[PDB]
């Protein structure tokens, strides 16, 4: 029993962060065979930031511009190059770390762990969800810029965000891990914000079914919905609209607790109406939109306890 | 900026976990230099959980009893004691990653991150508190005994939790890695419960302390306190007394923000008797109990 934000276990991530220095700045890499992949923003200068050419940026530095630092051993630079916004820093030693891996540019509503570091060291390890309006609710101070966003369902690590900045409201802003950014958002100082955000509805679903899981039902009635009502409704608390490939998803948890996911719904729509009348849902007194059905099925027992 | 329950990277502990299998019991241990440590309850079958005389139990336990796989490697096991409710296996070869560490007994209040495993397999890391009442909220299912909760210096792993079993309101009881149980609870199948619990004050005031640094300032007022004025507050809503030590452990987070621990203890005694009007602190409607202040400096600074 339980139900706690959980984060996959970062070591095999841990292997791959170098620091990165060129000229004055220093932030974070990420080192995966013989390649380490940055922000191309490590290239500017305060001033660069309002209108940076990166194309002229990069011409005017060599190999040897780039300092790469993993632990206490400096790898030499052999090659650069700019793909979008991530700058790939071909080096002479290939990371005898590096785990089972590959790309993956994940949709709002995702969730995913961030190895939170500072000048190539981790720091913590939390979970994050990219979220709709495509900003993550992080937790990075200066020197963060890249750390990584991955999941590691069955031993491969699937790397999905990359940390590139942090917008004026405090949410922050990344791309995947072929440098392209999430969102609208661009690796320059404009009057960017962030959209105003909206609540993962089929995530606050897959939480009520853990809860249910976990041998609460306080929060259920007697009512179904149609699919259309309960978007309408939805979406007058700011809730994302609800899809017939999230009711899918929805599915398994559905069987495991034999309530009709229209069913969840209806429950839904009244704890949205009523609140918690001083209630909590596990250990929380708000609805959480942080916690995926896969990522419920993960941590949750298979079954149910009735 | 940003503020999230934020555990320590865990890679030096992943390296230490093992599968410990005796008879058809299996469950984690951990494997440090040449001694893996694991809950002693591995040795008893359902039956003898109801009444286990460990001693008689263990004694009829030889090496060749116990099973230890790392990975897809097997340890042979060449030695057995038990420690408190740790049984220590002597093995054959010594764990090539096996981290700086101490074993180290943590207080109520304190935090940890657990790195929940199952078959000696990692498979989740999250934050957790050892409550007042000595329970943990954690997470976790059949299998994870054994799992443990660390916290981590520069280069050196603490370890202060072992998990040995859930009580009947789905919390968790331990012991540190000496095999001494937190909380008055033990390694038998007998009538165990969780004991009234309370809220942990110093970290709810370390709490309020981030929620400034990060912007929240709204439930800050021109009124202070005094300790004990607070302190009638506090036992007035379950809440655990504050001390001197506690006003002292926050002063750097005082002195980051500029503002007084009896200056805070007004804003929470208001929140305590008027709750929060419908707003939120750090995204919470609850007030978070599980961060202490040492947790709000490290994530507040960048600390690595
Ligand atoms: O280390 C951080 C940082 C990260 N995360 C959080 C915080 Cl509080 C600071 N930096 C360091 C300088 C670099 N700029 C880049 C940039 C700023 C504004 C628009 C777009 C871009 Cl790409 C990001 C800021
Ligand atoms: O794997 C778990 C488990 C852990 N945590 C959570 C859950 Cl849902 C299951 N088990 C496995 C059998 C062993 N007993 C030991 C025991 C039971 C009752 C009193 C004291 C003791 Cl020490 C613990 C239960
Ligand atoms: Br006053
Ligand atoms: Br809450
Ligand atoms: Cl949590
Ligand atoms: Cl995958
Ligand atoms: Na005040």
């Given at each position: 029993?339980?139900?706690?934000?959980?984060?996959?276990?970062?070591?095999?991530?841990?292997?791959?962060?170098?620091?990165?220095?060129?000229?004055?700045?220093?932030?974070?890499?990420?080192?995966?065979?013989?390649?380490?992949?940055?922000?191309?923003?490590?290239?500017?200068?305060?001033?660069?930031?309002?209108?940076?050419?990166?194309?002229?940026?990069?011409?005017?530095?060599?190999?040897?511009?780039?300092?790469?630092?993993?632990?206490?051993?400096?790898?030499?630079?052999?090659?650069?190059?700019?793909?979008?916004?991530?700058?790939?820093?071909?080096?002479?030693?290939?990371?005898?770390?590096?785990?089972?891996?590959?790309?993956?540019?994940?949709?709002?509503?995702?969730?995913?762990?961030?190895?939170?570091?500072?000048?190539?060291?981790?720091?913590?390890?939390?979970?994050?969800?990219?979220?709709?309006?495509?900003?993550?609710?992080?937790?990075?101070?200066?020197?963060?810029?890249?750390?990584?966003?991955?999941?590691?369902?069955?031993?491969?690590?699937?790397?999905?965000?990359?940390?590139?900045?942090?917008?004026?409201?405090?949410?922050?802003?990344?791309?995947?891990?072929?440098?392209?950014?999430?969102?609208?958002?661009?690796?320059?100082?404009?009057?960017?914000?962030?959209?105003?955000?909206?609540?993962?509805?089929?995530?606050?679903?897959?939480?009520?079914?853990?809860?249910?899981?976990?041998?609460?039902?306080?929060?259920?009635?007697?009512?179904?919905?149609?699919?259309?009502?309960?978007?309408?409704?939805?979406?007058?608390?700011?809730?994302?609209?609800?899809?017939?490939?999230?009711?899918?998803?929805?599915?398994?948890?559905?069987?495991?607790?034999?309530?009709?996911?229209?069913?969840?719904?209806?429950?839904?729509?009244?704890?949205?109406?009523?609140?918690?009348?001083g209630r909590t849902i596990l250990g929380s007194?708000?609805?959480?939109?942080?916690?995926?059905?896969?990522?419920?099925?993960?941590?949750?027992?298979?079954?149910?306890?009735?």
């Open positions: 029993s339980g139900f706690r934000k959980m984060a996959f276990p970062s070591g095999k991530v841990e292997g791959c962060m170098v620091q990165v220095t060129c000229g004055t700045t220093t932030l974070n890499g990420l080192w995966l065979d013989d390649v380490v992949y940055c922000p191309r923003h490590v290239i500017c200068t305060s001033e660069d930031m309002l209108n940076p050419n990166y194309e002229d940026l990069l011409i005017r530095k060599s190999n040897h511009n780039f300092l790469v630092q993993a632990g206490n051993v400096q790898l030499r630079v052999i090659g650069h190059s700019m793909q979008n916004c991530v700058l790939k820093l071909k080096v002479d030693t290939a990371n005898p770390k590096t785990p089972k891996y590959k790309f993956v540019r994940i949709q709002p509503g995702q969730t995913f762990s961030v190895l939170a570091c500072y000048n190539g060291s981790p720091s913590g390890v939390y979970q994050c969800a990219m979220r709709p309006n495509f900003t993550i609710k992080g937790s990075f101070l200066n020197g963060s810029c890249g750390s990584v966003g991955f999941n590691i369902d069955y031993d491969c690590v699937s790397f999905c965000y990359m940390h590139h900045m942090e917008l004026p409201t405090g949410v922050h802003a990344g791309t995947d891990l072929e440098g392209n950014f999430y969102g609208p958002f661009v690796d320059r100082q404009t009057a960017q914000a962030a959209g105003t955000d909206t609540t993962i509805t089929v995530n606050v679903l897959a939480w009520l079914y853990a809860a249910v899981i976990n041998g609460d039902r306080w929060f259920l009635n007697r009512f179904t919905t149609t699919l259309n009502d309960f978007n309408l409704v939805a979406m007058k608390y700011n809730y994302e609209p609800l899809t017939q490939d999230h009711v899918d998803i929805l599915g398994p948890l559905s069987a495991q607790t034999g309530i009709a996911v229209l069913d969840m719904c209806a429950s839904l729509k009244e704890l949205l109406q009523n609140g918690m009348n007194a708000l609805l959480e939109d942080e916690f995926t059905p896969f990522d419920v099925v993960r941590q949750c027992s298979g079954v149910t306890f009735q």
